[PDB]
Paper text:
In particular, cIAP1 and cIAP2 (cellular IAPs) are indirect inhibitors of caspases activity, whereas [name] (X chromosome-linked Inhibitor of Apoptosis Protein) is able to directly inhibit both initiator and effector caspases. All IAPs host one to three BIR (Baculoviral IAP Repeat) domains that are critical for their anti-apoptotic activity.
In the [name]-[name] structure, ten molecules in the asymmetric unit are assembled into five dimers (AF, BG, CJ, DK, EL), each arranged around a local twofold axis, in head-to-tail fashion, stabilized by the bound divalent 9a (AF dimer). The divalent Smac-mimetic heads bind to both cIAP1-[name] and [name]-[name] in the conserved IBM cleft, between the β3 strand and the α3 helix, roughly lined by residues Gly306, Arg/Thr308, Cys/Asp309, Glu/Lys311, Asp/Glu314, Glu/Gln319 and Trp323, in cIAP1/[name]-[name], respectively. In the case of [name]-[name], the 9a central phenyl ring, orthogonal to the dimer twofold axis, is hosted in a cleft between two [name] molecules surrounded by the N-terminal residues Asn249 and Pro251, and by the aromatic residues Trp323 and Tyr324. The interaction of 9a with [name]-[name] N-terminal region promotes order in the N-terminal amino acids (248–253) that could be modelled in the electron density. Binding of the divalent compound to [name]-[name] results in a crystal packing that differs from that observed in the crystal structures of the [name]-[name] complexes with monovalent Smac-mimetic compounds known to date. Such dimers, not considering the 9a contributions, are stabilized by salt bridges and H-bonds mainly involving N-terminal residues Ser246, Asp247, Arg248, Ser253, and Arg258, and C-terminal residues His346, Ser347, Glu349, and Glu350 (analysis performed using the program ‘PISA’). Such hypothesis is supported by the existence of a larger interaction surface area for the [name]-[name] dimer compared to cIAP1-[name], as assessed by the 'PISA' program (association interface areas of 652/459 Å2, and ΔGs of −6.9/−5.4 kcal/mol for [name]/cIAP1-[name], respectively).
Author numbering:
A (entry chain A): 246 to 354
B (entry chain F): 248 to 352
C-alpha cells in the first residue's frame, strides 16, 4: 500500500531494510550529491526512481535533496516521530532540528 | 516545501477571525462542511478543495465526503499551536493513536 501516513510505532514498516548493508546496496547507482553512507545510517534506502529515498522504519519519503544536505537533520525535520530516529539520535536532537527551524521561522516573518 | 510552524504566532494573521474565514467558503461546494472547516482554522484557497490553516500554514487537499476537518488538522499538523489551544493535547494524541491502530491491519 505504502500509505501516506508514516509509522511512529516501533514496528519497522519495511523490515527487509532494517539491515544497514542491505541499504547501502540500494545506493549502487546513486548519482546525487548527498553522502550515501550518512544516508543509510540515517535509515534510508533508495527507491531507484530519481533521488527518492524512503525510511525503512517510518516509511517516510524524501526528494529533491539539495547538495550536501544532512540525511540526519532532514529525517528529523519532516518525521519527528520515527522510533529508529529516536533510537539513534535521542529526543534533544529531534527537538533541536525543530527548535532551529522554529527560529529561522519568526526570525523575520 | 514548506515547514509548518510549531510556533505560537500565526502565519496569516489576516485570516485570524472566523468571519474572514467562512467568506472564502461562500462559493464552497464540496462534500466537506464549510462551517466546520472555518471553525477548524481553515480558509479556501480558491483552487479546488485546497484549504489552509491560518495559524500553522498547513494545506489539505483531495477531500472525501463527510471527512471531519478537525480530525485531519490534528492528523497532518500535530505541532499546530492554534489547534492545541482549541482542542487540548489529548484530542490530538487520540487521532494519532487511532491511526497507529491502522498501522497493524
Ligand atoms: Zn524514519
Ligand atoms: Zn493549524
Amino acid at each position: 500500500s505504502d500509505r501516506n501516513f508514516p509509522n511512529s510505532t516501533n514496528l519497522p514498516r519495511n523490515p527487509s531494510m532494517a539491515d544497514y548493508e542491505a541499504r547501502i546496496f540500494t545506493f549502487g547507482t546513486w548519482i546525487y550529491s548527498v553522502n550515501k553512507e550518512q544516508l543509510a545510517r540515517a535509515g534510508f534506502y533508495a527507491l531507484g526512481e530519481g533521488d527518492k529515498v524512503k525510511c525503512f522504519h517510518c516509511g517516510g519519503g524524501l526528494t529533491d535533496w539539495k547538495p550536501s544536505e544532512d540525511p540526519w537533520e532532514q529525517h528529523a525535520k519532516w518525521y519527528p516521530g520515527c522510533k529508529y530516529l529516536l533510537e539513534q539520535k535521542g529526543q534533544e536532537y529531534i527537538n533541536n532540528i525543530h527548535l532551529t527551524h522554529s527560529l529561522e521561522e519568526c526570525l523575520v516573518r
